[PDB]
Curated annotation (Swiss-Prot):
<feature type="cross-link" description="Glycyl lysine isopeptide (Lys-Gly) (interchain with G-Cter in SUMO2)">
    <location>
        <position position="57"/>
    </location>
</feature>
<comment type="subunit">
    <text>(Microbial infection) Interacts with bovine papillomavirus type 1 regulatory protein E2. This interactions may serve for the tethering of viral genomes to host mitotic chromosomes allowing successful partitioning of the viral genome during cell division.</text>
</comment>
<comment type="similarity">
    <text>Belongs to the BET family.</text>
</comment>
<feature type="domain" description="Bromo 1">
    <location>
        <begin position="16"/>
        <end position="122"/>
    </location>
</feature>
<comment type="subunit">
    <text>Interacts with p53/TP53; the interaction is direct. Interacts (via CTD region) with CDK9 and CCNT1, acting as an associated component of P-TEFb complex. Interacts with RELA (when acetylated at 'Lys-310'). Interacts (via NET domain) with NSD3, CHD4, BICRA and ATAD5. The interaction with BICRA bridges BRD4 to the GBAF complex. Interacts (via NET domain) with JMJD6 (via JmjC and N-terminal domains); the interaction is stronger in presence of ssRNA and recruits JMJD6 on distal enhancers. Interacts with NSD3. Interacts with NIPBL.</text>
</comment>
<comment type="function">
    <text>Chromatin reader protein that recognizes and binds acetylated histones and plays a key role in transmission of epigenetic memory across cell divisions and transcription regulation. Remains associated with acetylated chromatin throughout the entire cell cycle and provides epigenetic memory for postmitotic G1 gene transcription by preserving acetylated chromatin status and maintaining high-order chromatin structure. During interphase, plays a key role in regulating the transcription of signal-inducible genes by associating with the P-TEFb complex and recruiting it to promoters.</text>
</comment>
<protein>
    <recommendedName>
        <fullName>Bromodomain-containing protein 4</fullName>
    </recommendedName>
</protein>
<feature type="site" description="Acetylated histone binding">
    <location>
        <position position="98"/>
    </location>
</feature>
Amino acid sequence: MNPPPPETSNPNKPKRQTNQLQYLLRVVLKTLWKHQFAWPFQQPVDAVKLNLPDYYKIIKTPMDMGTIKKRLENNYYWNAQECIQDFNTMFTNCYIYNKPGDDIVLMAEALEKLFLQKINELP
Ligand SMILES: Cc1nn(C)c(C)c1-c1cccc(-c2ccnc3nc[nH]c23)c1F
């Protein structure tokens, strides 16, 4: 069975909308979102649909761009580093569960390259 998704709403969190966090939503996430290989990462891994009954038995901190987008829209992050950490968790989860050369890994690799290019310079 699928776990509940990561939390995206928490009114008790200390909240900020920095220039970098606005940029991470308006520019970085929304550009990655339109990439041709973004679709597998636009929502939590559906282990039931994808017949990956061991996915959430190996991956303990799931992450996806749908969750990141919801977090950014809720000002869930205090700084850009917290949000960048979620992107890196998303890519790293993919590389952990899969193997070099798998289609999903090539797709994550492409998105990661673009992600690193877009975050090289923040406001
Ligand atoms: C690419 C691809 N090719 N095929 C044969 C399948 C079933 C896929 C695929 C479709 C949808 C999501 C995912 C996926 C997303 C994030 N992480 C994953 N880890 C393993 N699958 C993951 C996916 F790989």
